[PDB]
């Protein structure tokens, strides 16, 4: 009885790191490695994985760049998954994927950079914008979920305001009127977290009517400060990015390490039946699939390359790090953020719009 593990998609530059990690275990329960490359027209990509990975009685699955029905399939049989490099928050749910256990912050949870970039300068007035899709709808729900706090339990303390939000479609058409409802208001702190192709269109339509001058203060999210954003935006913005980001291998080590760190805590339950071997012809459930998925919610080792791996209640990465960006004429300055939880300054030339 040797335990196995396998990748999913284009991790071709990593086929040796997993094996080196596997060797790095019994010298730190026989272990191996396998992999496959994804293919277009994902319909067969769903089927093409079972008789190769769910055949060998797998114990985990590792994906990369829209993760396939590996989100769905491994849920059947209840195979715990620890994916990566995927962002769209739809996987936040606990009832659309039985064990999706991500290792990033999902683009919603980047709320608290804002609420920690505003409650240090004593501002209290805002506006907001989101576009008709689930991700921001969560981000909207996220932001309106936190601002209830900071209330008076210390002995008559007060907090900020949550002025009239807006809504709009993915926006093939003009946005003026919607914006026209916002101009005459009495605030400037604007947020807008939709997407690259959305941000470009909205800036392209917003620079026409001069609501985009001085006094305004923008705190924009990740996928709106890149792509076509640099082709149409006027500067002053405060963009966000992660300290590892779109990378290759700074993280498979963390994956396999969290995997291996629990195997000693598993083998003392006298109920260590495996998941079945062979995708075709299975109708039961490995009665320790959700259990093996849940006990990973307590893996505590900081020795990762990007150390301190620890998953939130939703099982996504917690206590991450970001990069407080900024756009000048064409430059992109940086200051370091949170030290994990606080705020720390770094000498640079902060300008405001105008």
């Amino acid at each position: 009885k040797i335990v196995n593990i396998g990748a999913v998609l284009s991790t071709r530059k990593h086929e040796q790191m997993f094996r080196e990690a596997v060797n790095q275990a019994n010298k730190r329960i026989q272990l191996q490695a396998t992999s496959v490359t994804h293919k277009p027209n994902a319909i067969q990509m769903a089927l093409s994985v079972c008789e190769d990975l769910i055949s060998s009685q797998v114990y985990a699955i590792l994906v990369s760049h829209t993760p396939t029905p590996v989100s769905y399939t491994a849920g059947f049989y209840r195979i715990p998954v620890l994916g990566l490099t995927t962002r769209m928050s739809i996987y936040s749910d606990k009832s659309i994927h039985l064990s999706f256990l991500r290792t990033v912050p999902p683009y919603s949870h980047q709320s608290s950079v804002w609420f920690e970039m505003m409650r240090v300068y004593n501002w209290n007035h805002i506006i907001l914008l989101v576009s008709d899709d689930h991700e921001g709808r969560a981000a909207q729900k996220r932001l309106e979920t936190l601002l209830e706090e900071r209330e008076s339990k210390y002995d008559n303390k007060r907090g900020p305001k949550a002025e009239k939000v807006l809504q709009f479609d993915p926006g093939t058409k003009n946005v003026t009127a919607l914006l026209m409802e916002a101009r005459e208001l009495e605030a400037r702190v604007i947020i807008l977290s939709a997407s690259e192709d959305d941000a470009a269109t909205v800036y392209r339509a917003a620079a026409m009517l001069d609501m985009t001058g001085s006094g305004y203060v923008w705190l924009v999210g990740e996928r709106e400060i890149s792509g076509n954003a640099l082709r149409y935006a006027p500067d002053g913005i405060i963009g966000l990015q992660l300290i590892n980001g779109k990378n290759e291998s700074a993280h498979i080590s963390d994956a396999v390490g969290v995997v291996a760190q629990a195997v000693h805590e598993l083998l003392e339950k006298e109920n260590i039946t495996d998941p079945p071997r062979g995708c075709v012809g299975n109708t039961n459930i490995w009665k320790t699939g959700p259990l093996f998925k849940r006990v990973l919610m307590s893996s505590k080792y900081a020795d990762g390359v990007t150390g301190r791996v620890e998953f939130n209640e939703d099982g996504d990465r917690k206590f991450a790090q970001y990069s407080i960006m900024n756009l000048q004429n064409r430059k992109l300055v940086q200051v370091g953020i949170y030290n994990g939880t606080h705020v720390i300054p770094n000498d640079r030339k902060i300008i405001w719009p105008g």
Binding site: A46, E51, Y72, G75, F76, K94, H134, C279
Partner: protein, 370 residues
């Protein structure tokens, strides 16, 4: 070109044979349904897609009807995934592939049978009203949905001139094993007659086992629960007390034949309207996965004309999101026989109960006037 099928998969109800040809008014839909009624054995996701796609590429079915008999709460999403890049209207019917699934992609066309939690909550309010006691505290767990559950009350507890009230909207947290001193202490602060709930069976038995240790399960209060505790409708974990009311519907109303007749009627009435409003019909695509050249093609928008359609009779209208517009549910009182009765029915904002006055499980009397 549009094939139509019925695919019962692995149960004890191979009954759909002698009944699918009493719908002979579909020549008014000007299309003949290629009614292939395959019936597969027990099927696994590999085999699931195997059979489904083999048929969709040979029997070439441009609208299907599923059924199953199991507590597998994920199968429907697999078809949703199939329906996405294949563009297939699909109607999961029996318990299982028709269970409540909240958020799917925006491009597919896969629908279902059963009530979304919005209706499954509004009927709760109509129950409370009809018998003249007005809403009291809510109790909740972190299971997904609540951020869309409490809103449906707090947008109907208000837009009604009647005298609603409210109590402490609690919010627990369970899977911490060190905070057992922080759940009993959270549920020891309720003094109201009626109490909702929204959780899953694992947390359900746990709360009731700890609630019974708080003073809220015996005589005087009447816990009510939506359909998620309405699962395997034969269980009585000892911590459950009597009187527990709910709402659901599994089989007592419509049998599989008319149910699958319901489905064939739906799909064929759809095949009527668009193909009678116009004269353009979908195309026989080559394959579902191994095209390798037919991943790039055009798409059509029939998935709009399946909203306002009936059975030449009762309203079988459908949403754009997907659930039965005016669904047919029941109401069940957990008897002291450890079974589940039938003490109501709902249709177009109505309530009719086998009881006039609610019974007990005598400070209540009955006096006569003139």
């Amino acid at each position: 070109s549009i094939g139509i099928a019925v695919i019962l998969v692995g149960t004890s109800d191979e009954v759909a044979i002698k009944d699918a040809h009493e719908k002979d008014d579909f020549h008014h839909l000007s299309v003949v349904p290629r009614v292939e009624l395959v019936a597969m054995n027990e099927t696994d996701p590999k085999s699931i897609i195997t059979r489904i796609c083999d048929l969709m590429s040979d029997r070439k079915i441009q609208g299907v009807v599923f059924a199953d008999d199991t507590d597998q709460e994920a199968i429907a999403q697999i078809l949703d995934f199939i329906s996405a890049q294949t563009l297939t209207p699909i109607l999961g019917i029996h318990g299982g592939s028709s269970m409540i699934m909240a958020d799917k992609d925006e491009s597919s066309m896969f629908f279902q049978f059963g009530p979304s939690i919005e209706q499954q909550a509004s009927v709760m309010l109509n129950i409370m009203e009809e018998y003249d006691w007005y809403i009291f505290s809510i109790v909740t767990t972190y299971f997904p949905g609540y951020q869309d559950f409490v809103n449906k009350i707090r947008s109907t507890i208000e837009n009604s001139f009647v005298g609603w009230e409210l109590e402490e909207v609690l919010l627990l947290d369970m899977s911490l094993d060190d905070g057992d001193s922080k759940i009993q202490n959270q549920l020891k602060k309720l003094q109201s007659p009626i109490i909702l709930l929204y959780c899953t069976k694992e947390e359900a038995t746990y709360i009731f086992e700890v609630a019974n240790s708080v003073g809220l399960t015996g005589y005087g209060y009447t816990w009510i629960v939506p359909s998620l505790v309405a699962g395997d409708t034969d269980t009585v974990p000892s911590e459950f007390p009597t009187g527990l009311i709910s709402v659901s519907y599994d089989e007592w109303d419509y049998g599989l034949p008319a149910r699958v007749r319901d489905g064939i009627a739906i799909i064929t009435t759809a095949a009527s309207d668009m193909l009678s409003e116009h004269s353009f019909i979908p195309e026989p695509k080559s394959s579902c996965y191994n095209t390798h050249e037919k991943r790039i093609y055009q798409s059509n928008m029939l998935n709009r004309y399946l909203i306002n359609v009936t059975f030449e009779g009762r309203d079988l209208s459908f949403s754009e999101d997907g659930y039965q517009m005016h669904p047919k549910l029941v109401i069940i009182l957990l008897n002291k026989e450890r079974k589940w009765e039938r003490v109501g029915k709902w249709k177009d904002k109505s309530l009719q109960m086998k009881y006039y006055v609610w019974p007990r499980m005598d400070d209540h009397l009955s006096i006569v006037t003139l």
